[PDB]
Ligand binder design. Structure first.
Ligand code: T3X
Lengths: 112, 957
C-alpha cells in the first residue's frame, strides 16, 4: 500500500467507492486501517461519509477506531449522522463517544 | 534614615560599630540598618587610621566622588592612642560634603545628632508578591515604588548578597559551579548568574576586575620617536573609584577598520598589526600626586581612528558615570624636532588653532611648524570616513536667516548646495557634540535613517540630503489632501523599519515624534518616503528603553492614522476612516505595562501585511445571531436563521446600525434584489425553507406580499428576470415587472433534476447554473442548452466530495464550481463539457501557517482574473486566474466563512463583503478593498526593493 499525491491509500479509495471485496482483501493482507490523508480521513471516515454500512462493519471488525478525528475534528459518527441512521447504530454498538466535539463544538447527534 | 560606614582597609569600621561583601546589621537608637563596607559604589561615616596621618587622609576623595544626593559625610580618625600629634595636625591641614570631624562615646552621640497605610509591608513577606493577604491598597499594585522601597531599605532584593553574590572576587564556564551552583541553585536562574555581576561592575563580557594586578607588564611599542607617536594624557585629580573596571569594560569595541589584548588593574594595551595599536595604561609622574591616564598611538590613519575611538569612550564614561570631573585636565604632547623633550598643551589651545588653521607655529622659529593632525587628530576630524570630509570647493553655502531650513525649526540648519545637488547644512555655532554625533552617525546606514553627506572642520558643519517635502509634521498639518491611506501605511512602515534597526544597534532614540520624520516624496509607490532624524534641539513619550520607544511609535501611528490630534478612540474622536489591524496595533503598543508591549520587530511584522492595509471594516453582529445569506444594496440585507422562524436583518455599512425583524414563518435561506428603473423602485425577495417567496419594499417595509409558493424549499435567487431555484430541482422564471404583483405566477417553470437534486446556484457570464451533480445552461428563451454531468469528476478527486451538491458556480472562460462539504473546486470547460482543472484548498492551506478545515463554503470572482475562495475555517484563498497560483491566504480573523460577494459602497468604492462565523456563535462581516491581490503584490515588491537597498547601503557604507 502507498499514498498518492493527496496521501490517499488504496484502502481510502476502496472505502470511497464502497468496494466490499477490495476493502476486505486489503484488511486481510494487513492494510493500515487507521491511516489518514491530509484530510485526516480514515477508511471508516470515508465509509461513514459516503454511506456504506458493510464497509463500516468490516472496518470495525478489522480494528478501526470510532474516535478518530479528521482535519475538521469530525468522528465517524459525525459523518454517519450528517448523511443519515443504520451506520450510526453500528458505530454506536462499538465503543463510540457520542459526546465528542469537533473544532466548532458540535456533537455528532447535532449534525443529524 | 540609613547609617553606612566606609573608609580605608583596616581603618576599624567594625571596631567603631562595636564601640557605638557588605554585611548588614540592625542598630536601634532612629533604628538604622548599618552596612560594613569593591562592588557597585542616608548618612556617611568616613573612617581612617590616624597612624598614617594625612597619608591616610589622601586618596579618600573617591568616597565623596561616589550615587549620593548631597548626603552628609562624617569623618573620624581611629586608633588615636597609637598616633602622633603631627600626624593629627596634618589631618587637620588636609581638611560629598563633610559635616563634622572627630578623632575618637563621642562618635555615637555625633551619629545620633546627625541622624535626627504608610507602607506597612515586608514584615511577613521578608520572614510573585501580590497577597504575599492583601496589604495596604492592592499591595501598591507591585509598582516600581514598592520595589525601590524594598531595595533602599535593604530588606529584599540582600539575602544572597555578600554571601553568594559578589563572592566571585575571591571565588561563565567553570564559574557557576563554584559561585552560584553549590547546593540549591535551580536552572531557572542561569540568565541571572554572571549577569547581575555585570550590573555590579563585578563581571565583564570579555571577567572579575580583581584577578588583575597593579604591576604593569612589560610594554613595547613598535614606534618610539616623538614625530611618529601621538600622546594624550587626561590628568584627573583622582581616578574616581570604580573607573578602571568600566574603562576595561568599554575598551573592547574598538576597531581600526583585537589580535592582542594585555591588561591589568590600571591599564590596557590593544595591539593589531604594526602601525595599529593603543596603550591606555596609567602612568605616575615624579612630584605630581595626580593620576595620569596616558594614551600612546601611532600617527597613521588607523592610529588616528583608534585614538579617536579610545578618547570617545573615555569622555563617554566621564559624561555617563562620573559627571563630577567635567577637574580632569586633558593635554597633548608634541615635539618640533625628533629627540626634543615632549612638550604639553591643554586642549583649548590646538582647538583655537584647529579653528584658525592646520599648523602649530613655533613662537621663536616662525619657519618651523607642525600640522595639528600630527599632534592631536581629533580636533581636526581626521577620523572621518574618506567620503565624509567636506570639500569646501564643492559647497555653496549662505549663512543667513533667508535660506534657513524649516524656518529654523530643525535647529540651525540652512539650505545649501553640495556637488551641485541641493543640500542641508547644520552649523555647529562644541567639538564634543560634533564628535559624538559623528560617531553615532557613521555607524547608521539604513533607508529610514537620514544619510550623512559631509562633515566639515573649518565651518565645523554637517551637510545632509534635502528633504524636498519638509518633515512629516508639515505634511500632517498643512497639506492633508495628499495623505492617502497607502502613503500613511508607507510612512508608518518606513518609521518602524528603522526604529527596529536602532533597537538592533542597541540605540534608544529617546524621543520619536512626527517632527523627526523627513519626507522626500508623496508618491505612494516610491522606494523611500520617510526617514527619521534627530536635530538635537513632551507628550510623545511613555508615562516613564525599547518599551518607551514602542509607546512613542504607538503614539506616532495614532497620529498617522488620525491626520492630526486615556487616549480616545481615533475613529470616534476625529471621524477618520476606520482602519482595523492598525487600531489594534495602536492599542497594543499603548499598553501601560512595558512587558506587554510588542517589540519593534513584532510591530514592524504587524505593519508588514496587506491584510492590515486593505481591510476596510470588520463589523461584529450581536451574539447568538446566525445569518446564512446576504445581499448588498452602502447597506446589507441579511437572512437570520438562528431560530425556527427566519428573520430579515438590515445593516448600515456607514453607521453599523444593525436591526432585525421577524418576517417569515420559516428559516430564510436566500435573498435577492429586483430593480425596476422603469418605475424607479426595488424589491427584496426572500426565499425561505417552506418555499415561500416573500417580497418587501425597501423604501417602506409595510408594502409586503408573496409570490406563488413553490412545492419545496427555495435554495437560491438571482436577478431583466428573476430566477428562483428550489430544493426539488425546479427553476422558476419570473418577469421583473411581475414581482410587484401579489401571488404572481412565474413566467416559466423548468425541471432540471428531482427532489433529491436541488438547484442551488445561478450566475451570468447565456445563463449558467448548478443542480445536484449537473451543470446547466440557458439561452434567452429560458430553455436548456446543455447539461454537464459532474459525477465523472469522481474519476478524479474522491467520491466523498465529487458526488455531492453544487453550491456555487462562477464563469468568465471556465466553470469554477464548488460542492457542499468539499475542499476541492472543480474547473470545467464550458465549450467541451469536460473536466479540465482541480483546485485543492487543503493543498493551499497546508503550505501556509489543526485550526483549519479547508472545505469550500463560497466563491467569488473579480474582473482582474482573481478568484476568492472561502474555506470552512476562517480562511480566504486569493488566487490569480492566469495560472491558478496562490496570491494570498487571508486568515486569523474569525473561525468560519459563510459567503462573500463584491459590492459598491456609497462612495463608489468597490469592496468585498465576507460573512463568516466565529465558532458560542457570533456571525461576522468583513470588508476588503477590491484590489487586495494587487496591494499584496505591490507591497511584497516594495519590501523586496527596500530590503535590497538596505543591504546595498550596509555593504557600501
Ligand atoms: C542637517 C541635519 C543634521 C543632522 C541630522 C540628524 O538627524 N543626525 C542624527 C544623529 C543621530 C541619530 C540617532 N539617534 C538619535 C537619537 N539618539 C538619541 C540616539 C541616536 C539620528 C537618527 F535618529 F536619524 F538616527 C540622526 C539631520 C539633519 C537634517 C535635516 C533635514 C533635511 N531635509 C529637510 N527638509 N525639510 C527639512 C529638513 C531637514
Amino acid at each position: 500500500n502507498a499514498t498518492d499525491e493527496a496521501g490517499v491509500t488504496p484502502l481510502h479509495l476502496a472505502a470511497d467507492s464502497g468496494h466490499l471485496e477490495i476493502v476486505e482483501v486489503l484488511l486481510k493482507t494487513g492494510a493500515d486501517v487507521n491511516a489518514w490523508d491530509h484530510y485526516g480521513f480514515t477508511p471508516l471516515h470515508l465509509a461513514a461519509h459516503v454511506g456504506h454500512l458493510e464497509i463500516v462493519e468490516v472496518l470495525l471488525k478489522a480494528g478501526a477506531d470510532v474516535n478518530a478525528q479528521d482535519h475538521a475534528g469530525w468522528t465517524p459518527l459525525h459523518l454517519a449522522a450528517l448523511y443519515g441512521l443504520e451506520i450510526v447504530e453500528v458505530l454506536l454498538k462499538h465503543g463510540a463517544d457520542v459526546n465528542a466535539q469537533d473544532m466548532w463544538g458540535e456533537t455528532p447527534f447535532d449534525l443529524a | 534614615m540609613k547609617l553606612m560606614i566606609v573608609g580605608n582597609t583596616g581603618s576599624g569600621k567594625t571596631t567603631l560599630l562595636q564601640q557605638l561583601g557588605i554585611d548588614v546589621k540592625d542598630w536601634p537608637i532612629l533604628v538604622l540598618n548599618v552596612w560594613d563596607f569593591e562592588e557597585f559604589y542616608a548618612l556617611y561615616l568616613a573612617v581612617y587610621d590616624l597612624s598614617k596621618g594625612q597619608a591616610e587622609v589622601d586618596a579618600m576623595k573617591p568616597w565623596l566622588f561616589n550615587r549620593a544626593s548631597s548626603s552628609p559625610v562624617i569623618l573620624v580618625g581611629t586608633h588615636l592612642d597609637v598616633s602622633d600629634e603631627k600626624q593629627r595636625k596634618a589631618c587637620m591641614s588636609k581638611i560629598p560634603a563633610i559635616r563634622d570631624y572627630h578623632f575618637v562615646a563621642k562618635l555615637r552621640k555625633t551619629i545620633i545628632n546627625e541622624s535626627l497605610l504608610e507602607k506597612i509591608i515586608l514584615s511577613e513577606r521578608k520572614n510573585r508578591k501580590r497577597l504575599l493577604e492583601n496589604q495596604l491598597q492592592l499591595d501598591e499594585n507591585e509598582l516600581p515604588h514598592a520595589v525601590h522601597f524594598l531595595n533602599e531599605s535593604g530588606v529584599l532584593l540582600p539575602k544572597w548578597l555578600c554571601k553568594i553574590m559578589a563572592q566571585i572576587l575571591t571565588v561563565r564556564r567553570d564559574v557557576e559551579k563554584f559561585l552560584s551552583k553549590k547546593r540549591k541553585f535551580p536552572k531557572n536562574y542561569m540568565s541571572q548568574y554572571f549577569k547581575l555581576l555585570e550590573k555590579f561592575q563585578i563581571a565583564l563580557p570579555i571577567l572579575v576586575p580583581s584577578s588583575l594586578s597593579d604591576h604593569r607588564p612589560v610594554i613595547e611599542l613598535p614606534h618610539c620617536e616623538n614625530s611618529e607617536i601621538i600622546i594624550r594624557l587626561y590628568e584627573m585629580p583622582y581616578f574616581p573609584m570604580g573607573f578602571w573596571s568600566r574603562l576595561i569594560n568599554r575598551l573592547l569595541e574598538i576597531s581600526p577598520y583585537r589580535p592582542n589584548r594585555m591588561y591589568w588593574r590600571q591599564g590596557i594595551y590593544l595591539n593589531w598589526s604594526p602601525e595599529a595599536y593603543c596603550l591606555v595604561g596609567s602612568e605616575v609622574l615624579d612630584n605630581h600626586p595626580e593620576s595620569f591616564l596616558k594614551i600612546t598611538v601611532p600617527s597613521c590613519r588607523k592610529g588616528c581612528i583608534l585614538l579617536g575611538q579610545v578618547v570617545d569612550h573615555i569622555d563617554s564614561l566621564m559624561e555617563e558615570w562620573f559627571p563630577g570631573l567635567l577637574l580632569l585636565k586633558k593635554w597633548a604632547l608634541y615635539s618640533f624636532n625628533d629627540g626634543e623633550e615632549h612638550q604639553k598643551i591643554l586642549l583649548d589651545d590646538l582647538m583655537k588653532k584647529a579653528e584658525e588653521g592646520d599648523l602649530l607655529v613655533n613662537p621663536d622659529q616662525p619657519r618651523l611648524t607642525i600640522p595639528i593632525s600630527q599632534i592631536a587628530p581629533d580636533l581636526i576630524l581626521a577620523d572621518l570616513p574618506r567620503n565624509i570630509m567636506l570639500n569646501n570647493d564643492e559647497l555653496e553655502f549662505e549663512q543667513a536667516p533667508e535660506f534657513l531650513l524649516g524656518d529654523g525649526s530643525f535647529g540651525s540648519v540652512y539650505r545649501a548646495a553640495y556637488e551641485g545637488e541641493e543640500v542641508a547644512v547644520k552649523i555647529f555655532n562644541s567639538l564634543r557634540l560634533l564628535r559624538q554625533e559623528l560617531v553615532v552617525l557613521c555607524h547608521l546606514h539604513h533607508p529610514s535613517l537620514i544619510s550623512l553627506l559631509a562633515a566639515g572642520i573649518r565651518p565645523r558643519m554637517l551637510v545632509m540630503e534635502l528633504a524636498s517635502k519638509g518633515s512629516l509634521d508639515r505634511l500632517l498639518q498643512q497639506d492633508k489632501a495628499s495623505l492617502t491611506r497607502t502613503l500613511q501605511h508607507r510612512i508608518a512602515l518606513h518609521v518602524a523599519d528603522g526604529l527596529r534597526y536602532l533597537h538592533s544597534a542597541m540605540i534608544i532614540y529617546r524621543d520619536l515624534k512626527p517632527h523627526n520624520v523627513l519626507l522626500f516624496t508623496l508618491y505612494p509607490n516610491a522606494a523611500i518616503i520617510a526617514k527619521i532624524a534627530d536635530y538635537s534641539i513632551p507628550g510623545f513619550r511613555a508615562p516613564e528603553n525599547q518599551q518607551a520607544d514602542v509607546y512613542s511609535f504607538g503614539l506616532l501611528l495614532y497620529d498617522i492614522l488620525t491626520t492630526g490630534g486615556k487616549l480616545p478612540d481615533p475613529v470616534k474622536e476625529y471621524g477618520c476612516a476606520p482602519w482595523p489591524m492598525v487600531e489594534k496595533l495602536i492599542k497594543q503598543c499603548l499598553k501601560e505595562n512595558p512587558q506587554e508591549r510588542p517589540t519593534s520587530a513584532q510591530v514592524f511584522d504587524i505593519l508588514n501585511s496587506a491584510e492590515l492595509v486593505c481591510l476596510t471594516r470588520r463589523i461584529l453582529l450581536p451574539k447568538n445571531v446566525i445569518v446564512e445569506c446576504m445581499v448588498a444594496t452602502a447597506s446589507i440585507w441579511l437572512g437570520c436563521g438562528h431560530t425556527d422562524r427566519g428573520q430579515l436583518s438590515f445593516l448600515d455599512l456607514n453607521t453599523e446600525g444593525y436591526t432585525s425583524e421577524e418576517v417569515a414563518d420559516s428559516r430564510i435561506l436566500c435573498l435577492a434584489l429586483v430593480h425596476l428603473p422603469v418605475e424607479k423602485e426595488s424589491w427584496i425577495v426572500s426565499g425561505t425553507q417552506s418555499g415561500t417567496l416573500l417580497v418587501i419594499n425597501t423604501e417602506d417595509g409595510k408594502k409586503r406580499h408573496t409570490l406563488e409558493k413553490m412545492t419545496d424549499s427555495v435554495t437560491c435567487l438571482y436577478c431583466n428576470f428573476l430566477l428562483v431555484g428550489t430544493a426539488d430541482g425546479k427553476l422558476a422564471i419570473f418577469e421583473d415587472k411581475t414581482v410587484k404583483l401579489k401571488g404572481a405566477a412565474p413566467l416559466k417553470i423548468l425541471n432540471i433534476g428531482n427532489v433529491s437534486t436541488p438547484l442551488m446556484c445561478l450566475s451570468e457570464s447565456v445563463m449558467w447554473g448548478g443542480c445536484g451533480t449537473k451543470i446547466f445552461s440557458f439561452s434567452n428563451d429560458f430553455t436548456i442548452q446543455k447539461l454537464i454531468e459532474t459525477r465523472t469528476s469522481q474519476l478524479f478527486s474522491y467520491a466523498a466530495f465529487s458526488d455531492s451538491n453544487i453550491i456555487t458556480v462562477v464563469v468568465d472562460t471556465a466553470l469554477y464550481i464548488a460542492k457542499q462539504n468539499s475542499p476541492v473546486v472543480e474547473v470545467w470547460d464550458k465549450k467541451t463539457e469536460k473536466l479540465c482543472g482541480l483546485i485543492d484548498c487543503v493543498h493551499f492551506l497546508r503550505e501556509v501557517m489543526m485550526s483549519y478545515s479547508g472545505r469550500v463554503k463560497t466563491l467569488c470572482l473579480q474582473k482582474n482574473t482573481a478568484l476568492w475562495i472561502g474555506t470552512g475555517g476562517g480562511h480566504i484563498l486569493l488566487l490569480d486566474l492566469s495560472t491558478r497560483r496562490l496570491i494570498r491566504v487571508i486568515y486569523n480573523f474569525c473561525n468560519s466563512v459563510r459567503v462573500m460577494m463584491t459590492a459598491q459602497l456609497g462612495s463608489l468604492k468597490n469592496v468585498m463583503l465576507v460573512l463568516g462565523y466565529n465558532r458560542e456563535i457570533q456571525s461576522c462581516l468583513t470588508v476588503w478593498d477590491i484590489n487586495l491581490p494587487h496591494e499584496v503584490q505591490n507591497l511584497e515588491k516594495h519590501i523586496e526593493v527596500r530590503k535590497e537597498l538596505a543591504e546595498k547601503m550596509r555593504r557600501t557604507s
